[PDB]
Amino acid sequence: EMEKEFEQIDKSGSWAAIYQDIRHEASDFPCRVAKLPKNKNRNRYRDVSPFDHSRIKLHQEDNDYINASLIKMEEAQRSYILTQGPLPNTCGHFWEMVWEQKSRGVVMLNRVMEKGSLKCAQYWPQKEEKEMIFEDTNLKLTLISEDIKSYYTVRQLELENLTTQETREILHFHYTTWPDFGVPESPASFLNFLFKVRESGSLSPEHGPVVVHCSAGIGRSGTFCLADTCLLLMDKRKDPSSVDIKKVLLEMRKFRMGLIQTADQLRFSYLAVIEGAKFI
Ligand SMILES: [Mg+2]
């Protein structure tokens, strides 16, 4: 079992060593488009770039670049787009990607401000009466409703392509209580949040891939996708104990670098998967 592997790493205090192992084994592919000078103001962090092979291309001829990666998990039959928190100048791009990729849900795992600094542009409208227009990509975004709970908020938004007047309902799942430092004490609220997203259909094959982000779109976002995939595979397989988190993580890392940013995020991911299997 992975509960036994978990208890072993804990008693021997080897989380740091296991995490470094994954870092060393992790795929490395080029990010040539990300690193072009014209795209410098499209990247929040210089050390977080999408691989060319798995990057999400915007459908425009001017500049198709956004810092976003398609993670395609063949066996689990899930896809996810992990991306950075939109910058002041890439909100229109962000919502372009939602539109073009046919996403139903956006999972946001950070607050706009943490540790006294801006981590993310205010990319969605906070009031029904004050809709946003992204002039560069010709999209209108409207808050339709908002349901605030203790650990998360879910918002319904209307995204309209202004060129064609088509509209869609996008669901915004905002986990609002991830601590400024470290990881949650218990994974219970994060699993509950994950189940809410699932229950909405936003992770399902009849929709485009869910868009997941934190500030950089590798740490907390990696945790969400890693836990989700691992749990799905345990449901699907003849032998549930054959699902190795380390292997799933390494497979995900073929599609975007850096997923799971600390040994503590790794530990937490184990905890979340173990507890998730218990409940279900
Ligand atoms: Mg109001």
UniProtKB/Swiss-Prot annotation:
Give GO cellular component annotations, separated by semicolons: cytoplasm; cytoplasmic side of endoplasmic reticulum membrane; cytosol; early endosome; endoplasmic reticulum; endosome lumen; glutamatergic synapse; mitochondrial crista
User: Where can this protein be found?
Assistant: Endoplasmic reticulum membrane
Molecular function, one GO term: zinc ion binding
Q: How does it assemble?
A: Interacts with EPHA3 (phosphorylated); dephosphorylates EPHA3 and may regulate its trafficking and function. Interacts with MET. Interacts with NCK1.
Enzyme Commission number, as recorded: 3.1.3.48
* UniProt entry keywords in alphabetical sequence: Acetylation, Endoplasmic reticulum, Hydrolase, Membrane, Oxidation, Phosphoprotein, Protein phosphatase, S-nitrosylation
**Residues that bear Cysteine sulfenic acid (-SOH):** 214
What gene makes this protein? PTPN1
Task: Tell me the protein family, please.
Answer: Belongs to the protein-tyrosine phosphatase family. Non-receptor class 1 subfamily.
Q: What is the effect of changing residue 214 to S?
A: Catalytically inactive mutant; abolishes sulfhydration
- Give membrane topology per the record: Peripheral membrane protein
PTM-bearing positions, type Cysteine persulfide: 214
User: What is the name attached to this protein's record?
Assistant: Tyrosine-protein phosphatase non-receptor type 1
What is this enzyme's catalytic activity, as reactions?
O-phospho-L-tyrosyl-[protein] + H2O = L-tyrosyl-[protein] + phosphate
Active-site residue numbers = 214 (phosphocysteine intermediate)
In this UniProt entry, the residues modified to S-nitrosocysteine are 214
Tissues expressed in: Expressed in keratinocytes (at protein level).
Which portion of the complete protein is shown here? 2 to 281 of 435
| Cited function | Tyrosine-protein phosphatase which acts as a regulator of endoplasmic reticulum unfolded protein response. Mediates dephosphorylation of EIF2AK3/PERK; inactivating the protein kinase activity of EIF2AK3/PERK. May play an important role in CKII- and p60c-src-induced signal transduction cascades. May regulate the EFNA5-EPHA3 signaling pathway which modulates cell reorganization and cell-cell repulsion. May also regulate the hepatocyte growth factor receptor signaling pathway through dephosphorylation of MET.
Q: What is the effect of changing residue 180 to A?
A: Substrate-trapping mutant
The modified positions for Phosphotyrosine read 19, 65
